[model samples]
Target: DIFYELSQKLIQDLYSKIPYFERNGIEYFTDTRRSSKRVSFGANSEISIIEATIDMNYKVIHLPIYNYSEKWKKIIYKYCILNEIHSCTLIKKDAFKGRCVIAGSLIRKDDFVLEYKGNLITQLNEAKELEEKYALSNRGCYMYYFKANDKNYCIDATEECLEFGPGRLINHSRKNPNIITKVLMIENTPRLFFVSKRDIICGEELLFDYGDNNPI
Candidate 1:
């Protein structure tokens, strides 16, 4: 009796937590299965029983719950915080032949701009291999390189590029740059973050010098 009561309570709690979908006046709980049994009375006071099964003629949709890791969650939270305070957007510019630039509110010097979060590839060979397959224009132009532990590493932002953020849209300038970059290891992964090089006024385009060699 105790087990039965506990099981029933547990089931009720689970049912409350599960999410359901509704379409065309029908409520459905996805990825769930059901079964049933049947009983019948016979003429000579004997009982007969039968079982039944269900089959679907058409395809049904099933969705799984999404899960986020602690690192990703932290990144998302940081993104939200930066967006709230900095609030920058990308816009097309005619100066760089239609290339996009990061423009928005005023940023003070040395202010934390934004973090570049993406995949980090250790070997240069692997980075080159990926560039061969995915590169659309200049080879190694899109890769961000950093040095740690006496070895060089490349961070690939091609797949999950921070396009939505202002970090990736910053253009290069040789004479003057409003932003600068710093590399840090977060949870054993390298991340590149941008910081304001000097006090900037509103509507000013964000630019950073990629160096003469443009190693990154």
Candidate 2:
């Protein structure tokens, strides 16, 4: 059959032309890419893409990268989400602010500062059910809400206050905030990340502006 033969013919062509090597364990990440495009076929015209290898080490030895489509960035994000990190410090705030997120290192503008970790909830139903219970003792302040791709979402950091919860206890500011919250799609899931709005020094309290902007 023409279709059958052609399909297998192209399969071998692609398999030989570009291939993928399995990354079995530990799932490491890297910030630099030697190339910018990767494809079993093609995504972008040209970018650093990896050339795989197999010896004692099955490695993505040769490189280019994909920062193209969101799907392209997937390869980048998986390693990134679980990759390296910048640690943070937390402390009990003074008379005005209750709790604050502290800088463990110098955070430069546009750097990925931190992610606000919490239960993912859609404002459609689960979030509505949560509002009342969390609202009771001014706890609603812990629920961070945002919109992405035509859907309303919330990050419920109402609980999980163990030592150094990444995004759990950050205080918000309107005028002098250093970090900004953004929704990014990671592994096809919308996730919340905090980015530096400007250069932030160590020992400086981290702040973000919540949409609520409550006077309290």
Candidate 3:
């Protein structure tokens, strides 16, 4: 019953804020694809997943849905956010490399780029527990560890990794990243946001330095 109640509240929160769009007589938002044919993380695996295809040219965003209960599933099926700021397409690369997010249009500096949304893991031990349970490879890739309230916390997206919208598709770059990630507390919630460090040109690939901590 608690799960149901929380699910209902989350549904209401997402639906009340996010927008939706219509195309080709079908109503849906963003979509993702595998990084490459050689690198398959299985249907259920989260690694190498990136949103690369465009069903409609319009930009639509949606919140990450971690739980696939009937209620949450129904909500995602019905709604999505329609806006230009969140519009971008993923591009695939060669065998050694994966996919990357390309600017749909010219993006300006200091613009509110994107948000990384997922389940927050409050305890480090719990994060380790999950890795063991799932036998996850490159576990660090999906977990973003940060400090808040003088404590360590991680945003784990392994459950529904690509659910973070286009933010998940951003690859790492040390010197030439188009965007930088910053953590902000909104309504007492720790949310990771990406902002353009400099003016980005159209067709430019989006990159962010994940720091030395990220093994993947």
User: How many clashes in each structure?
Assistant: 0, 15, 2
Q: Per-residue CA lDDT of candidate 3, range 76-141, in tens?
A: 222222122343333444577655566644455544456666788887999878767667554445
| Model 2 residue 182 distance off true place after TM-score fit, in angstroms | 2.0
**Top candidate, metric TM-score:** 2
Question: What lDDT tens digits, residue by residue, belong to model 2 across residues 121-182?
Answer: 86557876788767776664477777776667777776744422446566767888877665
Could you tell me every candidate's TM-score relative to the true structure? Answer: 0.51, 0.57, 0.53
Query: Candidate 2 overall Cα lDDT vs. reference?
Result: 0.50
Error (Å) of candidate 1 at residue 63 is 44
- Where does candidate 1 clash, by residue pair? none
Clashing pairs in 3: 19-80, 19-81
Candidate 3 RMSD to the real structure? 16.1
**Candidate 1 error regions (>4 Å):** 1-87, 93-96, 135-141, 160-164, 212-216
